[PDB]
Every structure is written in structure tokens, then in C-alpha cells.
Design a binder for this molecule. Structure first.
Ligand SMILES: NC(=O)c1ccc[n+]([C@@H]2O[C@H](COP(=O)([O-])OP(=O)(O)OC[C@H]3O[C@@H](n4cnc5c(N)ncnc54)[C@H](OP(=O)(O)O)[C@@H]3O)[C@@H](O)[C@H]2O)c1
Ligand SMILES: NC(=O)c1ccc[n+]([C@@H]2O[C@H](COP(=O)([O-])OP(=O)(O)OC[C@H]3O[C@@H](n4cnc5c(N)ncnc54)[C@H](OP(=O)(O)O)[C@@H]3O)[C@@H](O)[C@H]2O)c1
Lengths: 224, 238
């Protein structure tokens, strides 16, 4: 029933895009936003992304700063928080950078439809948690993560995973770094894609703060 | 920045600004293209003040078909002041409508005084153009899509020095990708709409990495439950 505190942290263009229409990564934020993001990763118990992000960008999801890594190690944690990939069909690449870089637990959340041959390969490098039929049951995942010690879960995104989490009612707060650019594109991934809310189910927020950082602005929203 | 900031005395085109309201996730309406409550009374008053000071308001055919807006100034005081200063009660109303689909009973024709312009492409059906010419000036420009650069020149030439683009996702793209926009104002509302198919603040084709349009944040101002961001367009980041 219970779950971690859950927050989304992403960087988007002034027009709401996470990457181009080609699904390519571009420069949205500068060094100061990257330092803020590294502070969040250091204090989070776990970081989560979707399979889409893993296949597109192959991110390591590591804490970068030696001092943050040491501070975590000093308090008895792994240098990196737990790293979780949401991945229905067990397609996380075996040579993904998440497995190559750094210490810490990796968790692949898969669906019960996932092929067992792919799951066994993945289990060599990670804990595999199975939920749902053809897609991951994010509520059940969130309960299992909470059970195993995670009280703080940072969702860094994916346009579709952000939708999954917000529409399941699992999210406490939304952090959006808004960068000084227009990306454009009907098919460019946005801060929240997926199915979308109809007019009678819009998710209300409350603006907690707005802080200029370098050339953009960090908006923090509490979810209602 | 590389972008040359136009003003009311620039000879090629009007000063051009986009004013929209979007969700926290960048959407202008639902996946069903349904208009929802993004902003409140205070942003609506700011919006109405801006309309009053524009020479012309431009919207896409998609907005006309979805929302059937009048694009009128609402405050009787604003309208009176425009009239007292020798202007039309409402700014000029312009619809970007490649195939001449603007409905003959659209609200822009039923409500208020002033000039109406429908900008159409040369592929628009001749008979549809002729029927709209009963109710408006029709400007034919572009082969299969409206040429927005040429349209802006034509507007300047008629004496329009300030052009408010209320937008629509696709028109916002047309204007920004042609490098026609001086400033971008987005009221960011306190909601998530979501949806891969929901119209965003800028749709269309989209920029590649080498075409990204740079901005400069002029201001951020909290208003009721949301936040107004104003951006100066700085030009291509290359
Ligand atoms: N600027 C930024 O801050 C930032 C951060 C991260 C990513 N991005 C960008 O966003 C894009 C990737 O986003 P994306 O939407 O393609 O992928 P994504 O959100 O990373 O992952 C979504 C995928 O997760 C899987 N999933 C499994 N169970 C799910 C559930 N219950 N709800 C939702 N998803 C579930 C689904 O695929 P299966 O069903 O096949 O498992 C789904 O298509 C990339 O272009 C990346 O660069 C940007
Ligand atoms: N929240 C807000 O402040 C706000 C403001 C405005 C609109 N909206 C919402 O936006 C939603 C949908 O937007 P939309 O993109 O469908 O409508 P739109 O941008 O108002 O209309 C776009 C249309 O303009 C026409 N066009 C012709 N030549 C063009 C050119 N060179 N460049 C760009 N466009 C050209 C195209 O259709 P043809 O080629 O067929 O003529 C195009 O589909 C609506 O549901 C509305 O509620 C919200």
C-alpha cells in the first residue's frame, strides 16, 4: 500500500520538450542545474527512468561529484543511489552504461509477460522485480521499493514514464528546469506524454517556488 | 544573440510577439483539443490589456475550428480608450488558413467592429475564397501553406506595427521557425494535461540540434496560481 516520497526532476525547453523530434538529446541546462541534479541524486535513495530513456541516451545515472560520493559512503550508503529501469519486456541492454559505471544496486522492473531468457541474463547484473501483465504496475513497484528500504525516489523521466507516474497518482512533487530555448515539434517528447488527461481529470498543482538559475528557471510544483 | 530585435519603426514587418497560456507540462489544450482552464482572472486581464495595445491579433485555423474565439477586447474601458485615440475598437483580426476553411458563421465575423483578414495559400479552393471575400480581406500567399514572412510584410505595409500571435501550436511553430518572433510570453498554469497528442506551445516539424532557437529570460512573475515567463528571442544557437 505505501510508497517512497516520489519526485520528478527534468529539464525542458521553454516550449515543454525534453529532446528533439528525432528524440535526440540537446543542451537545455548549464553547469549549475547539473550541480543541483547531482545534489538530488546524492540525497535520493533511488533514481528511476524508463526503458525509452535508456535506449535513447544510455545514461549511467551516477553521482558525479567525488565529494558527494564520499559523503554518501561516509554515512554508510553506496556511492550511487539505487538505479531502477522501468522495462516491460526486459529489453534493457546488457552492455548499458548503467551496468558499466560505478557501484550500487541496479533494479530492472519488468512485466510478467517478459521473456524468462532475457530476465535470467539481466539477473546476473541486477535484481529483477516482476509486476503487471504487459506493462509494469507502477503502484506495486513503488510498494516493493518502499519495502526494501527506499524512502526517496527521484523519477528523472522519460516523457511516457512521467505520464505513468503522474496518472497513477504516485507523485508528490514536480521539478521542472525550464531552459532558454525552443525545440519545437509535434513528435518531440514533452515533459508528460502518454495518453493524456481529459478535460474532467486534469491534475492540479500548487507552485511551491521559482528560482532563476544561470540562463533558465527552476519551477517546483506540489501535486494535488 | 544573433536575432535583430524589431520595433514599431522596423520596415520589413511588425513587432511580433506570442502570448499563450500553457500547462506545467507545456500543453495548450487536451489530447482531444478541448480548451481547459489554465489561467485565472488576473492573467485574463493582462491578456485583455495586451490585446488592447496590439494593432492586430493573429490565430491559426485550428484555433478557429476548435474554439471559435471572437478575438475581441472585452473591457468597455479599453475599447473606449482605443476609440477615443482614433483606433478601431478592436485590433485587426487575422486567421492563418491555408485551405480557406474558416467558417462563414465564425464568431470573428459576428462580434464587434474592425477589419478581418484571412490569409490563404494558392491551393485554397477558388469558391471558398470567394465566399470568405464577402466577409473579409483575403490575402493569398504561399503555394500549399501560408507564407508567414510575406504575410507579415503585407501586414506592415497596411500599417500594422504590432502583431499579437495568440497562437495555436502549429502557427507558433510557423512564426518561430521563420525567425519572425521578437518576444515569447507564456503563462504557466498550475496543472498537468499530458498526452503525446496534446497540442504543445510549439508543435510543427520541430528543430534539429543545429536549428535550435535561443532565448533570453526577460522576466518571471507569479500571477494568481501560476507564473508568467517572458522570453526575448535571441536567434539560432549555432
Ligand atoms: N531533458 C530531460 O530532462 C530528459 C530526461 C530523461 C529523458 N529524456 C528524453 O525523453 C525521451 C524518452 O522518453 P520516452 O517517453 O520515449 O521513454 P521513457 O519515459 O523513458 O520510458 C517509457 C517506457 O517505459 C515503459 N513502461 C513500462 N511500464 C510502464 C508504465 N506503467 N507506464 C509508463 N511506461 C511504462 C514503456 O515501454 P515498454 O512497455 O516497452 O516497457 C514506455 O514506453 C528521450 O528522448 C530522452 O532523451 C529527457
Ligand atoms: N492556451 C492558449 O493560450 C491557446 C492559444 C491558442 C490556441 N490554443 C489551443 O491550441 C489548440 C490546437 O492548435 P493547432 O496547432 O491545431 O491550431 P493553430 O496553430 O491555431 O492552426 C494551425 C494551422 O494554421 C495553418 N497554417 C497555414 N499555413 C501555415 C504556416 N506557414 N505555418 C503554420 N501554420 C500554418 C495550418 O492548417 P491549414 O494548412 O489546414 O490551413 C495549421 O494546421 C486548440 O485546441 C486551442 O484550444 C490554446
Amino acid at each position: 500500500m505505501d510508497r517512497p516520497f516520489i519526485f520528478i526532476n527534468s529539464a525542458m525547453s521553454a516550449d515543454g520538450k525534453l529532446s528533439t523530434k528525432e528524440r535526440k538529446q540537446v543542451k537545455i541546462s548549464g553547469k549549475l542545474n547539473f550541480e543541483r541534479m547531482d545534489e538530488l541524486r546524492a540525497h535520493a535513495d533511488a533514481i528511476m527512468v524508463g526503458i525509452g530513456t535508456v535506449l535513447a541516451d544510455d545514461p549511467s545515472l551516477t553521482v558525479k561529484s567525488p565529494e558527494r560520493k564520499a559523503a554518501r559512503k561516509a554515512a554508510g550508503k553506496s556511492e550511487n543511489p539505487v538505479r531502477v529501469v522501468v522495462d516491460s519486456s526486459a529489453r534493457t541492454p546488457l552492455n548499458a552504461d548503467i551496468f558499466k559505471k560505478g557501484e550500487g544496486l541496479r533494479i530492472i522492473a519488468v512485466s510478467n509477460s517478459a521473456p524468462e531468457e532475457k530476465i535470467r541474463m539481466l539477473e546476473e547484473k541486477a535484481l529483477v522485480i516482476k509486476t503487471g501483465a504487459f506493462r509494469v504496475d507502477l503502484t506495486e513497484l513503488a510498494a516493493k521499493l518502499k519495502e526494501m528500504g527506499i524512502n526517496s525516489l527521484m523519477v528523472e523521466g522519460g516523457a511516457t514514464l512521467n505520464w505513468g507516474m503522474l496518472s497513477a497518482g504516485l507523485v508528490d512533487e514536480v521539478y521542472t528546469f525550464v531552459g532558454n530555448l525552443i525545440i519545437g515539434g509535434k513528435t518531440a517528447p514533452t515533459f508528460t506524454d502518454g495518453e493524456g488527461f481529459t478535460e474532467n481529470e486534469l491534475l492540479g498543482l500548487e507552485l511551491s517556488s521559482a528560482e532563476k538559475i544561470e540562463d533558465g528557471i527552476l519551477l517546483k510544483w506540489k501535486v494535488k
